Structure formats: C-alpha cells, structure tokens
C-alpha cells in the first residue's frame, strides 16, 4: 500500500491537472490585444542612500511611504528618511549575517533575521531614547528568509528547514507551524487584508496558506527551479513569482494555475525580487546581471530597465501609494526611482 | 538652505554616519576565515587547536594583533547555494580533509566537495588554505593497507611522503583560476604550529591583495 498511496497521489494530482485544463478556456494575451501599451517607462534616480559598507540584503518600506529599513551585512540595520535622505536610526545587530528585514504597519517595530536562525524584534518608540531588542524569537533550525508583520502583535516567518511559522510577539511562542514544503522556503508576502499568505520554496512550488487555520489551501507548481521572490497582486487575488531560471510567472488564486510567464530570451540569470505597482499594471523584477526590468503585467513586454548598480539587486519594493520604487543591491547603495 | 530645525536632524544623520564609519573601520581590522569541510574531517580538532544558535558557530580569537574571526558553518544542515553568497568577502576558506579516505569513498567525496567549493562562482579569487588531518592514522593505514582503494590510477611507492604529495597534488590540481592559490599542511599531532601556518598564510594572502589592489601585480 506504499506504492498504492503513491499512485493515489498520482491520481489526485492528475485530476488536479484535469481541473486546471478544463477551467483553462483562454490565454491571458488573447485578451491583451485590445488594450493599448504603456511604451517606454524611463525612471530616474531621485535619491541615492550611501550608508552601508557591506552588501545590502533587505529593504522594506514604511506604511507612511516615507521611512525605510535596510538590513545589510556590515551588521547594520538602519532606518532612513527618504524625502530628505537622512538616517533616523542605525541599529547594530548581534549576528552580522542578516538576510531579511521588516517594518511594522504601525511603524513601531522592526523585525530582523538571518543565518542566526533567530528573528529579532526591535522596538523603536522606546521611552529611553535608543532602540532595544524587545523580543528574540528562536524556534527554527535553518536560516531565515523573509519576515512580515501582521500587526504589532504577530509575525509570520519563513525558514530554511522547509517550514514557515506564525509567532505571537508578546509571548514569544510559535503559535502556528506551517509545513508541507520539500525545500527551503525563500519568500513570503501577506495579503492586503492579511487573511492568508503565499510562500515559495526551493522546489518550484508556491503554496498558498491561510494564517488563521494553519495548513495549506492551494499549491502552484509551474517553475523549473528555485523560487526566490513573491509579491501579491494589489487586489489579493493573484501573485507573481520570480525564480532562478530567469523567468517570472503569474498565478491566480481562483483559477489555481499559471497565467502568464514573463521571460525574455536575452535574460539568463534569475530573480531576486518581485513587486507590483499600485494599480498592478506594472511589475518590477530584480536580476543578477545588475539591472531591474520593468514588465507589463498584461502585455508581457519589457517596458523599460532600471540599471545603475555595480552588483546584483537584492531587494526591491514600491511604496503603499505607488510614488517611488526603492531598490538595493550588493554595492551598498540603495536607489529610489520615480 | 531654508531648513527649519531639521538641521538638527541632519546633525543626527552626520553623527550616526560618523559612528557607522568608526565601527566599519574597527570591524575592517578583523580577518575573516570561513572553515569548511565534510562531517568528521577533523575541523573540530583544528578549532580546538585555536585555544579560544546552532546555525553558524563563530570563533573569535587573536594572534600577533590579528583578530581572527573563524566561522564554522557545518551546523547549517541545508543546501549551501543559498548562503554562500553571503560568505564572499571572506579572506580564506580553511579546508580540512581527513587522511583515512577509504571508507563510506570519503576522499572522493571530499574531492568532489573541494572542487565544487573552489570552482564556485563567488570564490573565484579567494584562496583556500587547506589542512590535511589524521596524518599518523594515514601512516599506520599505509603501514598495513594500500590506499589505491581510493586511487586506482596511482603509480609509485607505498611510502608516506610520496602518498602525501600525491594526494596533495590531487587536491591542488582542482583549481583553475590564476589569481588564487592553495596552501597545504599536515596536522593532528601539531601542537599549535598550525595557527602559525594560518598566520603566515593569511599574511601572504593580504600582501597579494595589497599588490593586485595597488596595481603592482
């Protein structure tokens, strides 16, 4: 009954592929022929942020679209004004291998994590002046890959031992463990209503989970190699996905399948960052050949490139009003584009 | 100008830029060494031969005013290709390979590990100081057994020095870049001369960086 359970799994995934084929009645670019394109979208560097020394690994905007967190491997997690390019905090980490960062929707807390297997939660609005390590969450065994805040009270993390988790901050205890991946999960993105979230791992399988129940709702497997970045559509019903086979695909939640693959023949190196615009018409993708491609979300054509980095872009994100897109590479500079 | 009182804010910005600069200097005096190797290669023996939370075990010590950070990363039970791109800017990969390479095959496994880690796209110019432990065990193992079990195409004597130089050339033949190099040593009876070897080898790497950084190379 071991191979009987195996062939039963084959039976159910073949009927899933049957349902995905039977619900597929068109292609996406069958419908994009009527909508007029966007043309050349050139964007200038408005600010550059020369603060770090080692390579930058993560960036995250603030919900008032002005402040900014960058976490970089000089052992420094520094938060930034962006209108007048000041630095408003510089927090020295404990372990100088940091592969993620996060910034609270209320703007009070900053999460951090890396190869220390420990997600730290820094308070910012302390009465005593400076910042203090308020919580120190330590439950995984692999490294950390992405952290996001639901509110000031619970944080969902993604790890290197194939698991994700949801922590309660004020207790410091692993409230929920999500598992079901077969490789290292390397991205994370909440819904805009924060009811449910996706995570993409090193086995090309972006899984959609829900934070309230505690186990996987949907699975999407379209890529050929390791998923490295995920962002949602702004309506919450779709999400893009970049991987290290130089392509980035777009999946729907209700249609349960791939919809469109942005991949140009000139490109050979993978993604490190995917985001959207405010309306969702654009898509922003980082790369390893040191430039960032703007894509159409519908017409699948390259609408402009944002080059200007001596090393590969490792973080990217637009604000919550669509005004600017920040990016940050391993050259320690962190650019802003309009 | 026309700034209202946020010139105090840019005073704060200049102050913490100054602090970032000073800590960057103070951490740039350090010398970082990533220690690699397979499981049971003897790397715990060389890290206890330095005489000074389970992801990365760090060992900071110092010797002749050289702060050696030594990152032992063998606790990271995952795929290496997702965190060795943060271990560039290290100045050496210490590499330990045991000399009992006959069982569950090991020196073939250590050989594949070595030429996967030295032909890696990030360590294309970082130089591998290479250690070779368990040498008296190798002496007894050639005193009774042939290690052509590991090397079927080997020609030569069954003595210690020739076999040592043969496996040393086998390891040194695995690199292909001109601007990096491999040092070699034997250990496991060495009472802290290997730390002196680490010191002189890393000074050789630092003067080579100072040569090809100042354009004289």
């Amino acid at each position: 009954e071991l191979d009987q359970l195996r062939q039963e799994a084959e039976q159910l995934k073949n009927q899933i592929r049957d349902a995905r084929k039977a619900c597929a009645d068109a292609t996406l670019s069958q419908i994009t022929n009527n909508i007029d394109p966007v043309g050349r979208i050139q964007m200038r560097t408005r600010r550059t942020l020369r603060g770090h020394l080692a390579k930058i690994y993560a960036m995250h905007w603030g919900t008032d679209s002005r402040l900014l967190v960058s976490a970089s491997q000089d052992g420094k997690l520094i938060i930034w004004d962006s209108y007048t390019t000041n630095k408003v905090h510089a927090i020295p980490l404990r372990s100088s291998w940091v592969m993620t960062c996060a910034y609270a929707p209320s703007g009070n807390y900053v999460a951090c994590g890396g190869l220390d297997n420990i997600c730290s939660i820094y308070n910012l609005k302390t009465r005593e002046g400076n910042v203090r390590v308020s919580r120190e969450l330590a439950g995984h065994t692999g490294y950390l890959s992405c952290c996001r805040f639901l509110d000031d009270n619970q944080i969902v993390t993604s790890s290197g031992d194939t698991t994700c988790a949801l922590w309660d901050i004020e207790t410091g205890q692993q409230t929920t463990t999500f598992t079901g991946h077969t490789g290292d999960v390397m991205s994370l993105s909440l819904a805009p209503d924060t009811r449910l979230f996706v995570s993409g791992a090193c086995d090309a399988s972006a899984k959609l989970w829900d934070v309230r129940e505690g186990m996987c709702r949907q699975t999407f497997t379209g890529h050929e190699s390791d998923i490295n970045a995920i962002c949602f559509f702004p309506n919450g019903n779709a999400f893009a996905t970049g991987s290290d086979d130089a392509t980035c695909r777009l999946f729907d939640l209700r249609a349960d399948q791939e919809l469109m693959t942005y991949s140009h023949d000139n490109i050979i190196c993978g993604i490190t960052s995917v985001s959207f615009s405010k309306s969702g018409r654009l898509l922003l993708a980082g790369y390893d050949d040191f430039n960032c491609n703007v894509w159409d979300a519908l017409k699948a054509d390259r609408a402009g490139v944002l080059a200007g980095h001596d090393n590969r872009v490792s973080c990217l994100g637009v604000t919550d009003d669509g005004m600017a897109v920040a990016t940050g590479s391993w050259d320690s500079f962190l650019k802003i584009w309009n | 100008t026309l700034s209202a009182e946020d010139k105090a804010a840019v005073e704060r910005s200049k102050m913490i830029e100054k602090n970032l600069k000073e800590d960057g200097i103070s951490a740039a005096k350090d010398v970082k060494l990533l220690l690699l190797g397979a499981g049971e290669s003897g790397k715990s023996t060389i890290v206890k031969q330095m005489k000074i939370t389970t992801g990365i075990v760090e060992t900071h010590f110092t010797f002749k005013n050289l702060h050696f950070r030594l990152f032992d990363v063998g606790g990271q039970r995952s795929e290496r290709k997702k965190w060795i791109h943060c271990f560039e800017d290290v100045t050496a990969i210490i590499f330990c390979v045991a000399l009992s390479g006959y069982d569950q095959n090991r020196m073939h496994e250590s050989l594949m590990l070595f030429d996967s880690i030295c032909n890696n796209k990030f360590f294309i110019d970082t130089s591998i100081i290479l250690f070779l432990n368990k040498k008296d065990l190798f002496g007894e193992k050639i005193k009774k057994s042939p290690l052509t079990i590991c090397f079927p195409e080997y020609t030569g004597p069954n003595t210690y020095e020739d076999a040592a130089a043969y496996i040393q050339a086998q390891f040194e033949s695995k690199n292909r870049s001109p601007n990096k190099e491999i040092y070699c040593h034997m250990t496991c009876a060495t009472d802290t001369n290997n730390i002196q070897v680490v010191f002189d080898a890393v000074t050789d790497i630092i003067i080579a960086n100072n040569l090809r950084g100042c354009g004289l190379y």
């Epitope: 004004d81 007048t84 005593e128 400076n130 | 102050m15």
Partner: single-chain antibody
Framework: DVQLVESGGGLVQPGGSRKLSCSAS????????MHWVRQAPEKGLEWVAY????????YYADTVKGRFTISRDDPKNTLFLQMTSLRSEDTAMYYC??????????????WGQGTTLTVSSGGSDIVMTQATSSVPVTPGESVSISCRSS???????????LYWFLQRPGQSPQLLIY???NLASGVPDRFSGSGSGTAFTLTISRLEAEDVGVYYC?????????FGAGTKLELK
Amino acid sequence: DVQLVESGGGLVQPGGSRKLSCSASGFAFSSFGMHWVRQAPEKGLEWVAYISSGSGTIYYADTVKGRFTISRDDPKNTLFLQMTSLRSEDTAMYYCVRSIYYYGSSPFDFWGQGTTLTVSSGGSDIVMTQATSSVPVTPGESVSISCRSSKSLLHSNGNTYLYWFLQRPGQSPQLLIYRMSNLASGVPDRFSGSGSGTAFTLTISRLEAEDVGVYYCMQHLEYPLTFGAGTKLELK
C-alpha cells in the same frame, strides 16, 4: 523611569557666578539634545540655552548670550550651566529639558523639576501672544483656548512647528501637543489641537480636575523659541 535631577541654586549675591548641574539617569543621554528653560516667579517660560547632541551646535537667548555658558559631560551624563555676571533679572526657576530630534520625534517630552535662583537686588524674534488671560472651568465641560503667532509657522516642508505644554500647579510642565496636531505619548486622548498658519487653538473635551493648570504655546521654527504668556485655568 527617566530622571532629570538638577541642582545648584540658592540665595546668591549679584554680579557673581553660579553653576547648575542636571544629572540625567534612565536613558541614553549622549544621543539627546538638551535645553535649559527658566521662568519668572510670576511670569511665563522663556528659552535660555540649548546644546545639541554631541555638543555640535550651541544656541543662546539674546538676553543672556555671552554672560552664560552650557556644556555636558556625557560619560558622567551631566549638563552644566555655568552662569557669570548674575543680574537681578535672573531670579527664576530653571528646568533641564530633553528634546531628541529626528523625523517624527517628540521634542521637549520630559522635563526636570527646576531649581531656584533667587538673587538679591543688584530684535525681530517671532513674538507669540496668548490673547487669553485666564478662564474659569468646571468638570464635564469642553473648552478651547487660542494662541496667535506673528509670523506664519507652516514652513515649506509641510510641518507647523507649534507646541502646547501644560504646567500643573506646583509641578513641572508636561508636553501635550507637538507640531500643532500630533498628540504626545502618555497624555490622555481628550486633548486635541489644530490651527492655521498664525492662529491656533487647543480643544480639551470633557475636562476633569487633573487637567487644570497653565497652558503655554511655543514656536520652534527658528531660534530663539519664545513662549506665550500662558492662560491659567481654575476650577469652578
């Protein structure tokens, strides 16, 4: 908690020199900006001195400048006001104030308890008037006070640098409203403030017996910072 304990006052002979020492304990003192603010035995506040973080810039009031000096010993976390040539217009209570500045900070958030310098008997600043003298209040009611500047305060960056303090009788001045609409941290929510350009107002809704005292507005657009006269409230 955080502590600002200052010392060095007394019945001191005029024309001489004194020293005031503010010892601060409970926070990272070396990253704060420090103000010295005095006030008369019958009149309102007035700014006296300011030293930034790391002793970068030092600003004085023009009625005091040259005569005094201000310094800090941040390994000792103390703040010194060395005052020379003391006239009879310096008989005042003096407060040590912490006013950290970055984007979104709350300056003047915490105040010392004041020491007294009672000595014997021996120009285009942005003047700011509180046109109200004092009104009678009662609990259960809501009441709004006003403060009119001379120059418009809404600087080009989009801010409006007006601060509302409350000093309780026999106490130290708390901070109520910073930058004309942002509420302070720890103050109850029943206060609010707004205004436009030059003329501003503070609406306290559902007044209680704790919220009686004197209320000062203060600009922060440029140095010097001058306070209003301060409207007093009194119960029944």
